[PDB]
Enzyme design. Structure first.
Site, mmCIF file in Angstrom:
data_model
loop_
_atom_site.group_PDB
_atom_site.id
_atom_site.type_symbol
_atom_site.label_atom_id
_atom_site.label_comp_id
_atom_site.label_asym_id
_atom_site.label_seq_id
_atom_site.Cartn_x
_atom_site.Cartn_y
_atom_site.Cartn_z
ATOM 1 N N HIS A 79 -11.077 -31.253 -13.337
ATOM 2 C CA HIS A 79 -10.978 -29.936 -12.721
ATOM 3 C C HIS A 79 -12.070 -29.800 -11.668
ATOM 4 C CE1 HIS A 79 -7.750 -28.464 -15.050
ATOM 5 N NE2 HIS A 79 -8.386 -28.561 -16.217
ATOM 6 N N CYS A 128 -8.429 -31.301 -9.530
ATOM 7 C CA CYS A 128 -7.353 -30.387 -9.847
ATOM 8 C C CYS A 128 -7.887 -28.998 -9.580
ATOM 9 C CB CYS A 128 -6.906 -30.538 -11.295
ATOM 10 S SG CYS A 128 -5.481 -29.504 -11.720
#
Ligand code: QYQ
Ligand code: QYQ
Lengths: 354, 363
Positions: A79, A128
């Site tokens: 992330h 992400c």
């Protein structure tokens, strides 16, 4: 001919987030990238699922390796957070919602890298949502398949071409694919003013203290315990094996290599691991490596063993001490006999550091 | 297969005459030469010197409206710049000392607006002194130290000297810029004087040499052509006839979109008239023309060194810079001081002339 003083790479893949959706691609991608970089003679440290404190320590130690002329490569998959013009790498212990102070600022690392006299410094972010710095920033929206960025990068990374030209080809490959057009993007920043490639040979290896410090740290992070033959009082012999999947993931496997004639049936299993590893006994002693979550080193492991995956080795502060149990039933008898032996294999892989 | 441009437009800004900061010289030559290289690549170009904050915001916002789907845009800025808190800024000529962010143009804000476009190629080149398919070249050079030996004022800056040797190549713009970065690295003179960062999200094989898509007469295409045609309109040559019989030709040439050169010459003189001087005066106050710089025997005496070669010889020259400040018709007077054969008296005459709103003032 451009040469590298040394080739060092730090690869981090975050997947099992405490308060954020889980990712699958970093596992496959970090493993793929580790073996591509080993082919180009990089000394690589590959780590899965790191907390903020672990990532900050890993990045600071990697930056200390960047002596004059060294080629560095920092890859992060997981992330990513974007806030007020800055991007941040999200550790597995991040709170929900993301806060800056809990994440690693990408621009702070770039600023630390610009202070180095490296011959080449590649920083790849697969998220992400002179220093000679080449920065690649791949972004995609939220089984064993590679992520988009690695799918294209792996098929070009071994090319003997200037890193900027090679990354430019990767960006063009993505723009020519319909899967990428509305899902994945790539941004490259570079202040590279020389012909530099990941394929550049390493300069005539002298034995200076500076180079020995770099080799020592990496050598420690790669130390696996040797295979062991445990001899029990009842004659039974158990072979104990150790395989490295990542710098913080080790697979342990056991096999009853010798069973006396007088013993009808016997079972061996590993138990009582250090609590800091957080090994759930229900995930240990599997008949296949795949059942432990180990799908990458599986092929290169002996068959018909019992397997246990020890991840989170970076959390081990003591010696890796565990127990090998044995449950055997004697011939023509109705009793099950138990016997156990403690094993101390020291500080394996990244746990060898202090 | 061959990628195509729907259109090709470029905005070039060169700031040299700073009110509260040091004066630069290289933007003059660099903006002029880059304009001509881009024209060779079939770009419609607008070239502007010495813009204030207000003028710069208008020029950039108006260039951003040209960036329709498939269009190739190029923005080039030469002048003072500064980096404050991760953001870089383009300094206008009216910026106070020290720099204030609200008075400067934020580069990151411009890149964000370009990201919202469906351009085929968007090139942003900053040559500063200290999906969209965007390619951003950030060049920074060391400000000239007080005791350094200055060379000719008509020399290229470091970035443009390297860029002009590669710009015409039929190669992908990212690869071309990467070769410029490498050329600067080989030149050891630039080691601590010139830096260059290239940032790119180009996902296709785009080049500045890509042909324009089979020329059409659509409304959207005609809008870009019209604005650019207005900014290139010069007044036509005039022949002014005076009562005494003298005829004076008044000519006009463009050096930049906001710089025009006016020139006068005697095109007919009656035999009875011997002395005969024509000179220009009464220019709009907004242009701030110093009469000591006007009516020169050479273009170079007006500060015009680039279009000098293409100007007719044996004229009197006046350089009208800051045309973007003209808020009404460019009205001025052509004066005639003459003398008849055998007489000591100098006779005077004048004629007022209206030449509309030339070049960028036509907007
Ligand atoms: C210079 O050393 C070598 C091995 C090295 C790196 N060092 C490094 C990697 C990970 C950590 C973290 N560690 C153990 C802790 O944070 C510990 C600090 C002491 S503790 O008791 O808190 C246990 C956790 C993490 F990420 F594993 F967690 C710390 C250091 C980094 N990149 C490279 C690339 C190459 Cl090539 N070598 N190399
Ligand atoms: C779309 O139009 C074309 C001509 C155009 C641009 N437009 C543009 C607009 C305004 C200005 C400014 N102007 C007049 C004012 O700011 C005036 C505002 C009204 S005012 O009366 O205050 C006088 C100043 C400045 F910079 F010259 F100053 C400059 C250029 C910009 N880039 C390109 C590239 C291509 Cl190709 N065409 N193109």
């Amino acid at each position: 001919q451009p040469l590298a003083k040394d080739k060092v790479a730090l690869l981090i893949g975050n997947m099992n987030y405490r308060e954020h959706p889980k990712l699958k691609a970093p596992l496959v991608d970090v493993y793929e990238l580790t073996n591509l970089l080993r082919q180009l003679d990089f000394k690589v440290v590959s780590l899965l699922d790191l907390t903020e404190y672990e990532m900050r320590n890993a990045v600071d130690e990697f930056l200390l390796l960047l002596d004059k002329g060294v080629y560095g490569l920092l890859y992060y998959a997981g992330h990513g957070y974007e806030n007020f013009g800055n991007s941040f790498m999200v550790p597995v212990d991040a709170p929900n919602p993301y806060r800056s102070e809990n994440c690693l600022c990408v621009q702070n690392i770039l600023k630390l890298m610009q202070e180095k006299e490296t011959g080449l410094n590649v920083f790849l972010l697969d998220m992400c949502r002179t220093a000679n710095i080449v920065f690649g920033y791949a972004t995609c929206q939220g089984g064993l398949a590679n992520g988009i960025f690695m799918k294209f990068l792996k098929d070009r990374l071994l090319e003997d071409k200037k890193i900027t030209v090679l990354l430019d080809e990767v960006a063009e490959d993505m723009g020519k694919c319909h899967l990428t057009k509305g899902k994945q993007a790539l941004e490259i920043r570079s202040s590279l003013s020389e012909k530099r490639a990941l394929t550049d040979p390493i300069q005539g290896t002298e034995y200076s203290a500076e180079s020995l410090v770099r080799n020592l740290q990496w050598a420690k992070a790669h130390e696996l315990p040797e295979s062991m033959c445990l001899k029990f009082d009842c004659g039974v012999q158990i072979q104990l094996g150790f395989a490295a999947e990542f710098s913080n993931v080790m697979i342990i496997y056991t096999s009853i290599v010798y069973k006396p004639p007088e013993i009808i049936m016997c079972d061996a299993y590993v138990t009582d691991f250090p609590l800091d590893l957080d090994i759930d006994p229900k995930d240990a002693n599997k008949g296949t490596p795949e059942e432990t979550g180990s799908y990458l080193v599986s092929k290169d492991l002996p068959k018909h063993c019992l397997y246990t995956r020890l991840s989170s080795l970076q959390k081990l502060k003591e010696h890796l001490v565990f127990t090998v149990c044995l449950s055997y039933q004697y011939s023509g008898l109705e009793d099950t006999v138990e016997d156990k032996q403690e094993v101390n294999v020291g500080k394996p892989l990244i746990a060898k550091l202090d």
